[PDB]
Amino acid sequence: MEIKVTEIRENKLLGRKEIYFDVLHEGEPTPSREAVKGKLVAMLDLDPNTTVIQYIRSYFGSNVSKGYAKAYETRERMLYIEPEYILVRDGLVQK
Amino acid sequence: ARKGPKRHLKRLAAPTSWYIHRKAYKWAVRPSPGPHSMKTSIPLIYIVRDYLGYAKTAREARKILNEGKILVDGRVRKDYKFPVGIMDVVSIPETGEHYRVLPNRIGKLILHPISEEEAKLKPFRINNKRMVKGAKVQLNLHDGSNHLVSLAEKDAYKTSYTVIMQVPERQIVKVLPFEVGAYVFVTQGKNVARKGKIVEVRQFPMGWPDVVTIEDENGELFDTLKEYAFVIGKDKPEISL
Amino acid sequence: GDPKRQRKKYETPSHPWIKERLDRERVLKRNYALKNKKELWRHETQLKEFRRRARRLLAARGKQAEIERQQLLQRLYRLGLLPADAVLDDVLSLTVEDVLERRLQTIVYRKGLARTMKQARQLIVHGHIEVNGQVIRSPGYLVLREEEDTITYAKGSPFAKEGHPERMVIEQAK
RNA sequence: AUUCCGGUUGAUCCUGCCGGAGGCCACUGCUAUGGGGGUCCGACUAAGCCAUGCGAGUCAUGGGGCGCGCGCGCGCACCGGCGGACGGCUCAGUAACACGUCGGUAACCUACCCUCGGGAGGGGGAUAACCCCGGGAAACUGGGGCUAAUCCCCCAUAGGCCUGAGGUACUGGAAGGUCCUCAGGCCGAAAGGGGCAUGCCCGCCCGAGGAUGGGCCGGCGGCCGAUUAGGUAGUUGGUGGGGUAACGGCCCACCAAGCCGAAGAUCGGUACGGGCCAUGAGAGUGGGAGCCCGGAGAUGGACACUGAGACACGGGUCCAGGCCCUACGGGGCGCAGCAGGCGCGAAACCUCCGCAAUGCGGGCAACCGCGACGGGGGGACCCCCAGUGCCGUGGCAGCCACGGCUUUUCCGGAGUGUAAAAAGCUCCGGGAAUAAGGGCUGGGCAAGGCCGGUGGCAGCCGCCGCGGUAAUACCGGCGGCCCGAGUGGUGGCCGCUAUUAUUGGGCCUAAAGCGUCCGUAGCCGGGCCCGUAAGUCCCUGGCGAAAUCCCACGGCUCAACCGUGGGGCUUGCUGG
């Protein structure tokens, strides 16, 4: 699977880096959040924490999925801005 | 049957001056009473969320608003219902961004980016005059605001002139009159967002408003109403359009 | 008042049992491998819409009129039913066989990717045919002019290998 | 597709009606694989009756106090504050300034909100919670003691209202308006409170204006009936006053005799109004449940309190009519809110999950609540895209034998998806196997002159017409044609219909000229000249919400759908 960053965007008010990326998986299924996070952090020098994946989406026939990710400066601002359902869905918090 | 005032607003019934999706949902933010009208203003949350894109939901927008990270006319505004309007200035000092609110040739409101120097001035149109106790003159402006002046200098302020003012402290500079060579910016009607110079005024009897003719720099002439002709300069503009 | 209801996009004939119409539609159905009469009827309705737009615009004075004229001509050129140096009278000479030729099933046959129209329909529906980059499964897609050369077999598909038994049986025709 | 076909005669040409053939809505028979989108589903009869559970709350940074742990922190209730007048349901009544559009209020009210200019001084009081004692079957409720406030009251000062006499500073098209000076009088504010801290945050009262929302007025516009022709008596106006937030016969006292009407008043019938919808080549005809804007109602009817706002669906009082609990003294209730039930009928769903998204109220905020909203469940509601196999050889006339292939769909699984799920999307394993019917078969009208039964019986039949012993017309069998996950039956509307005719019909003989004349309103009106510019024509300013309609581009695989822009619609009004 390849991961190709299409856009990065900066937010000073909430203190976040928004990231739009494409995933290329020709012949394979839709990949997993763990793997996508590993690749993202390895490639952009980010913390495995303070990083969440809002969605990975597949289309009708593409073998090319899309993603949206957010990288925060501080775990505190993170837990304050982001709701709990994505945190549980990612694994950064135990319900 | 209705026993009182309204507190909701549906999206199919929202004014046309807005950039909004009408079928995505059923409900819209009803603005609160304030400076401008409903047909001439848009709340702040729509700016924070749908124009600039600093938030995707409304909780995030409320959160940034309740921390003084956004100003309007040099003042902090925490209410997501506050109506923003024409000739107003939106300032984000954490990103160095300054926008001025203006309409299009279509009638919709937009954000024109300006500089920090011009972000400290706001033009006002004198809409009426009154004499109040202490024998003082009260000018009633176009955003619903008011200014006090002495009697000695009453003949210098009339009911269509324009006044430039430092926004937060609200001190006057550079009055501009309504004459036959003044620069103009139309704010409503069929010829909205056009610009040009005045040529002729015309009056009518028994309640009908006054009309004015204007010439654009391509040389073409067009008429409109006198209350729609915002004065912004003498020979050239003082702000950015 | 009464609100909106979605309406059909195809028309039915005025009489169901006229010999000439029956014969013609029979021949077309057979020679283009259609499943119903709805498809034929909706292609015919497309044509009739184009034809009515032309009839209306013709000799209409203004600015929106010429705008719509150019829009129509460009749309037809893009679909592939008219050349570039065309005029508003070349529309009224069009027929339904052209609209029928501009669909995937027929193009896949005329291109040599399938031996028959039914085989082409099966390929399209099972997902072995690609457009510029995509997998489309609708044999009535109305291919455009800039895509007719980007139609191939999909990467994941046995037919995409040159030595497939059935692909060799297909190339055995040409 | 600006369309025709069958039927009066032994045969013919006409008029004229009936039927066929197209589309949309409601009920319904037989049959049924799968997805996506959407403003669909107790409207028609009973605005009939309802068992159970939910549909409106929040603030601990307003105040005192109880409990649990270390003055602090957690939790509960009470007083107090804002809200509950929005949102949600329905179509009874209403032929009306109710609705639409243009205008007006110089004749009016407005808590939450914005701007500006100014203020927060001095005293007093009670009473819930808490403790003692209780009563009543309950619903509900009594006495005593103690206490606080952003609770209540009082003085003062600001300020509010009336009147009279003057000055003319402001707006405006125009001052019974605002401002200045004087005079005589009635009513009459406020919480410097709370928090952090060694000044900042949230707040209280007055005034001038705006915004938001409403009340009132006016011109134009839009059903049927003459087997309904005269109606009205505070009825029409005036003078003077009361009352209202405010103009006004809205009401009162007095003076007059007016007001509406054949260009159809009054009366009676039906009916929420529009944007819109169906149909048609178009003119035109018909409808107005679902989504938006406005209005009205909450078992029928009448009347009031609190509040900025109600004569108040989930708050009050009474009468009528219905039902329930009771310890028989007395008490309580009305789903046209979500689901669920009875009844009525031809005729309409789960007593489900959530406040994550869109929004509202409360709160400095964090945040809580919401049967609104969102999400799934059941349903031949409407629209879009597909499936029920393909290839080659051979034999027949689309089928069969043979040999290979594919997996939309099906069976099972891993990810993503989702508030959590499900579905959908990507991948893997198996395997042509898991999936066509309904009406018709004499002509109109496409398609059998084939076979067996019935024998003027039984039955068919929109219409014409078959059937009385070789039935192409009944019943069945085998074949065939139309449409196709759909196809038929009943009722309603448009079209067919130039059978309602402005475009565009007819009246010697077929329906149809008054028995004939004179004349009122009304409609139609000879030729030239001068004027005006009301109708009419052109150009331009301000209005006719959005959705809906047409076109192009772009985003969900294309589409249906959504978005950006350009045009129309809004049957028109108005300033030059």
Tab-separated table of C-alpha atoms in Angstrom, chain C residues 16-147:
chain	number	residue	atom	x	y	z
C	16	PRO	CA	-49.371	-0.164	-28.679
C	17	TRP	CA	-50.278	-2.329	-31.683
C	18	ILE	CA	-49.163	-0.683	-34.927
C	19	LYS	CA	-47.378	-3.072	-37.270
C	20	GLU	CA	-44.741	-0.655	-38.584
C	21	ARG	CA	-43.597	0.580	-35.181
C	22	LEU	CA	-43.592	-2.995	-33.914
C	23	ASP	CA	-41.405	-4.203	-36.789
C	24	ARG	CA	-38.930	-1.326	-36.501
C	25	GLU	CA	-38.558	-1.647	-32.736
C	26	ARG	CA	-38.175	-5.415	-33.119
C	27	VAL	CA	-35.318	-5.003	-35.584
C	28	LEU	CA	-33.568	-2.435	-33.394
C	29	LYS	CA	-33.974	-4.490	-30.219
C	30	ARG	CA	-32.515	-7.536	-31.951
C	31	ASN	CA	-29.601	-5.765	-33.637
C	32	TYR	CA	-28.542	-3.831	-30.526
C	33	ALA	CA	-29.287	-6.519	-27.909
C	34	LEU	CA	-31.602	-4.608	-25.603
C	35	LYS	CA	-33.579	-6.124	-22.747
C	36	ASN	CA	-36.746	-4.014	-22.868
C	37	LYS	CA	-38.423	-1.226	-24.789
C	38	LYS	CA	-37.784	1.285	-21.983
C	39	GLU	CA	-34.176	1.706	-23.112
C	40	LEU	CA	-35.097	2.348	-26.737
C	41	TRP	CA	-37.817	4.738	-25.616
C	42	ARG	CA	-35.551	6.786	-23.364
C	43	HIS	CA	-32.857	7.116	-26.021
C	44	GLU	CA	-35.609	8.299	-28.364
C	45	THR	CA	-36.664	10.772	-25.682
C	46	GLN	CA	-33.119	12.140	-25.453
C	47	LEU	CA	-33.210	12.715	-29.202
C	48	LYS	CA	-36.623	14.387	-29.047
C	49	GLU	CA	-35.386	16.724	-26.310
C	50	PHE	CA	-32.395	17.800	-28.399
C	51	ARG	CA	-34.717	18.286	-31.397
C	52	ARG	CA	-37.189	20.439	-29.393
C	53	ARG	CA	-34.401	22.616	-27.999
C	54	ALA	CA	-33.158	23.257	-31.529
C	55	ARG	CA	-36.666	24.025	-32.863
C	56	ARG	CA	-37.210	26.529	-29.999
C	57	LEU	CA	-33.855	28.315	-30.179
C	58	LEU	CA	-34.063	28.663	-33.946
C	59	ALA	CA	-34.788	32.306	-34.854
C	60	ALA	CA	-35.030	33.416	-31.209
C	61	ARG	CA	-33.536	36.853	-30.592
C	62	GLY	CA	-31.550	37.931	-27.555
C	63	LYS	CA	-28.413	36.845	-25.709
C	64	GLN	CA	-29.523	33.820	-23.711
C	65	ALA	CA	-30.629	32.390	-27.060
C	66	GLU	CA	-27.155	32.385	-28.614
C	67	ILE	CA	-25.664	31.256	-25.304
C	68	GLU	CA	-27.957	28.220	-25.317
C	69	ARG	CA	-27.224	27.562	-28.997
C	70	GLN	CA	-23.492	27.343	-28.367
C	71	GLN	CA	-24.126	25.241	-25.260
C	72	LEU	CA	-26.144	22.743	-27.304
C	73	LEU	CA	-23.574	22.485	-30.079
C	74	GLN	CA	-20.691	22.014	-27.638
C	75	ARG	CA	-22.626	19.376	-25.692
C	76	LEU	CA	-23.270	17.437	-28.895
C	77	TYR	CA	-19.632	17.651	-29.985
C	78	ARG	CA	-18.558	16.392	-26.568
C	79	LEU	CA	-21.004	13.486	-26.665
C	80	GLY	CA	-19.721	12.569	-30.115
C	81	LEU	CA	-22.776	13.081	-32.323
C	82	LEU	CA	-21.571	16.089	-34.335
C	83	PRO	CA	-18.315	17.483	-35.725
C	84	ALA	CA	-16.850	20.800	-34.640
C	85	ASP	CA	-17.744	22.970	-37.646
C	86	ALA	CA	-21.447	22.234	-37.278
C	87	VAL	CA	-24.651	24.267	-37.289
C	88	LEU	CA	-28.117	24.195	-35.756
C	89	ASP	CA	-29.647	22.495	-38.808
C	90	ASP	CA	-27.377	19.438	-38.577
C	91	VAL	CA	-29.297	18.462	-35.431
C	92	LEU	CA	-32.572	17.713	-37.209
C	93	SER	CA	-30.890	15.086	-39.412
C	94	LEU	CA	-29.784	12.989	-36.443
C	95	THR	CA	-31.414	9.631	-35.770
C	96	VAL	CA	-31.710	7.190	-32.886
C	97	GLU	CA	-29.098	4.760	-34.226
C	98	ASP	CA	-26.411	7.296	-33.297
C	99	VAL	CA	-27.559	7.534	-29.685
C	100	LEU	CA	-27.593	3.731	-29.779
C	101	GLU	CA	-24.029	3.628	-31.103
C	102	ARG	CA	-22.754	5.922	-28.346
C	103	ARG	CA	-23.249	3.348	-25.541
C	104	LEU	CA	-20.656	1.077	-23.933
C	105	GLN	CA	-22.127	-2.211	-25.130
C	106	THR	CA	-21.913	-1.178	-28.775
C	107	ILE	CA	-18.483	0.441	-28.457
C	108	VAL	CA	-17.029	-2.598	-26.691
C	109	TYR	CA	-18.301	-4.642	-29.623
C	110	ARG	CA	-17.066	-2.285	-32.362
C	111	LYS	CA	-13.638	-2.136	-30.682
C	112	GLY	CA	-12.913	-5.870	-30.689
C	113	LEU	CA	-13.050	-6.445	-26.934
C	114	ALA	CA	-16.023	-8.800	-27.325
C	115	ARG	CA	-17.301	-11.197	-29.963
C	116	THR	CA	-20.979	-10.293	-29.496
C	117	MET	CA	-23.161	-7.632	-27.927
C	118	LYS	CA	-24.448	-10.044	-25.294
C	119	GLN	CA	-20.888	-10.993	-24.372
C	120	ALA	CA	-20.061	-7.296	-24.117
C	121	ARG	CA	-23.034	-6.730	-21.824
C	122	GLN	CA	-21.880	-9.585	-19.599
C	123	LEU	CA	-18.348	-8.180	-19.439
C	124	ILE	CA	-19.622	-4.716	-18.523
C	125	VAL	CA	-21.987	-6.036	-15.869
C	126	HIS	CA	-19.461	-8.407	-14.269
C	127	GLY	CA	-16.857	-5.654	-14.104
C	128	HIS	CA	-14.146	-6.417	-16.639
C	129	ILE	CA	-14.324	-3.129	-18.582
C	130	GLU	CA	-12.552	0.078	-17.582
C	131	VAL	CA	-13.014	3.684	-18.650
C	132	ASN	CA	-10.265	6.269	-18.447
C	133	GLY	CA	-9.703	5.149	-14.908
C	134	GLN	CA	-12.797	3.578	-13.378
C	135	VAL	CA	-14.986	0.492	-13.419
C	136	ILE	CA	-18.446	1.203	-14.832
C	137	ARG	CA	-21.149	-1.472	-14.796
C	138	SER	CA	-23.924	0.314	-16.724
C	139	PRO	CA	-24.183	-0.690	-20.408
C	140	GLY	CA	-26.045	2.551	-21.217
C	141	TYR	CA	-23.441	5.044	-20.048
C	142	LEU	CA	-23.266	7.195	-23.227
C	143	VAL	CA	-19.507	7.274	-23.670
C	144	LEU	CA	-17.948	10.627	-24.509
C	145	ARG	CA	-15.553	11.559	-27.310
C	146	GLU	CA	-12.397	11.891	-25.199
C	147	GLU	CA	-12.876	8.517	-23.468
